Design a protein around this ligand. Structure first.
Ligand SMILES: COc1ccc2c(c1)c(CC(=O)O)c(C)n2C(=O)c1ccc(Cl)cc1
Ligand SMILES: COc1ccc2c(c1)c(CC(=O)O)c(C)n2C(=O)c1ccc(Cl)cc1
Ligand SMILES: COc1ccc2c(c1)c(CC(=O)O)c(C)n2C(=O)c1ccc(Cl)cc1
Lengths: 262, 251
């Protein structure tokens, strides 16, 4: 049943889950509760058009660019949360400082899209800490350059969410993503792969115990990692179109460094 | 199932051995040193190997075209192999075509790695060895079409997989249920599910040593698809060169 090796893996899964809850205010469990059905101030105000958007700004704490800026800041914040979480991953802070930067530089967006799926269903996405919900249709109808940014995330989210992972699963998966080893520019790949192998072992057991009847969930989840890369690249090219189409459009420095020479 | 997975593994290996002329074991012997292949390291050596070895104006272009000739050949070998995978033939015909159309490229690079090392690649069934430098020394954008494969190969070969491993991995690549246009994704995923179990057992029995090799191999699929997207890119750019009708059709 349980053994010395298996026991260390469960301890790691728990540590990671506990750190995950402490680092990310809006978990998938909370997201799903708001999306499925409640009464408490859990019910989100829905934005599906210009007027409703107008209304949401009064109920929630051109539009194309206003949505852009809001989504832009939330990513900066997400980077901060992910960065905080990364430090809790055993051995991560002990690695060469440059590699810590490299790992974050490349894992941050893959993680952002992974967790964003937790806030999405086929019809829309929770915003402003769960207070609002912006429909998929509204986002897809935005001015040419802007109405093409979210669909690819929704397409991914609908399929990824089909795996039915919960937060304890995601906590370990997110750690695996960060501690890659095949990221461009890494100095000491060995120590990084040793940590990842251990996280992989933890994720494998975690999925088997939490999802007994889900055959090869582990392999299916790992394959999803390719969907994430695709999302990142595609997103980058779309970002380049924006930089040129809206010379009056900014872009937070933090995000700008992540994308530099990516 | 313990035994049902090994039967599947053995079956794929046997079929893979029969569908693919040059195996990794075969190529490895030839690559490290175990008939010394003709080496193409520069222009004159190529020219010599052409009439001396006999393969099948402007070198960069002819080399690029030879890559296509071999790719098309490989496709038939892969198609035949795909047909030996249990369940494949019973799938909707259009899906089979969809799965092959999107999978051959991934498989081509996977297998191409078996014939590469950090210094070059084995050509024309091991008879030759085109050097990595000669390839990188090609002009226009041609001196950069093989390099990404080498970099992928270098990383992929580090897993030290053997033919029996690759046989199952290649079947997994073919039965990808996320290919665009599929009409009945279920059977495809049910087969890949069965193949993934077989691949997992195979890697644990064949390499007790390397921890999480199964997971590491699957992560390599991220790399593969990038090599492909990237390859499709260069191919379109190449579509901007002046320097048949029936051949252009075949390819
Ligand atoms: C998945 O990408 C998005 C897209 C739109 C977003 C957000 C995130 C967040 C943040 C979040 O969801 O956590 C908010 C608040 N969005 C807004 O709709 C918005 C609307 C008007 C203004 Cl002025 C500013 C922001
Ligand atoms: C959670 O995933 C996303 C999705 C879209 C994003 C971003 C992050 C970031 C932040 C980043 O990429 O670091 C920017 C700047 N996005 C946009 O360009 C954008 C354009 C138009 C609209 Cl309507 C909404 C968003
Ligand atoms: C699985 O599909 C392929 C695709 C391309 C290939 C090969 C196999 C092999 C392996 C083989 O042919 O045995 C080689 C050597 N490829 C070349 O890059 C190449 C380049 C220039 C010329 Cl002129 C000829 C071949």
């Amino acid at each position: 049943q349980l053994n010395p090796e298996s026991a260390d893996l469960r301890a790691l899964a728990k540590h990671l889950y506990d750190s995950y809850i402490k680092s990310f205010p809006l978990t998938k469990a909370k997201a799903r509760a708001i999306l499925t059905g409640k009464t408490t101030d859990k019910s989100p105000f829905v934005i599906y058009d210009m007027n409703s958007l107008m209304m949401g700004e009064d109920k929630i704490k051109e539009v194309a660019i206003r949505i852009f800026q809001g989504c832009q800041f939330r990513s900066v914040e997400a980077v901060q949360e992910i960065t905080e979480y990364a430090k809790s991953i055993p051995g991560f802070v002990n690695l060469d400082l440059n590699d810590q930067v490299t790992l974050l530089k490349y894992g941050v967006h893959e993680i952002i899209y992974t967790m964003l799926a937790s806030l999405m269903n086929k019809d829309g996405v929770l915003i402003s800490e769960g207070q609002g919900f912006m429909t998929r249709e509204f986002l897809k109808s935005l001015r040419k350059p802007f109405g093409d940014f979210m669909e690819p995330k929704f397409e991914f989210a609908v399929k990824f969410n089909a795996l039915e992972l919960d937060d304890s699963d995601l906590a370990i998966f997110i750690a695996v993503i960060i501690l890659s080893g095949d990221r461009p520019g890494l100095l000491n790949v060995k120590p990084i792969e040793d940590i990842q192998d251990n996280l992989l072992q933890a994720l494998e057991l975690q999925l088997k115990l939490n999802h007994p009847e889900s055959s090869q969930l582990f392999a299916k989840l790992l394959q999803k990692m390719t969907d994430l890369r695709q999302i990142v690249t595609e997103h980058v090219q779309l970002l380049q179109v924006i930089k040129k189409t809206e010379t009056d459009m900014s872009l937070h420095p933090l995000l700008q460094e992540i994308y530099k020479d990516l």
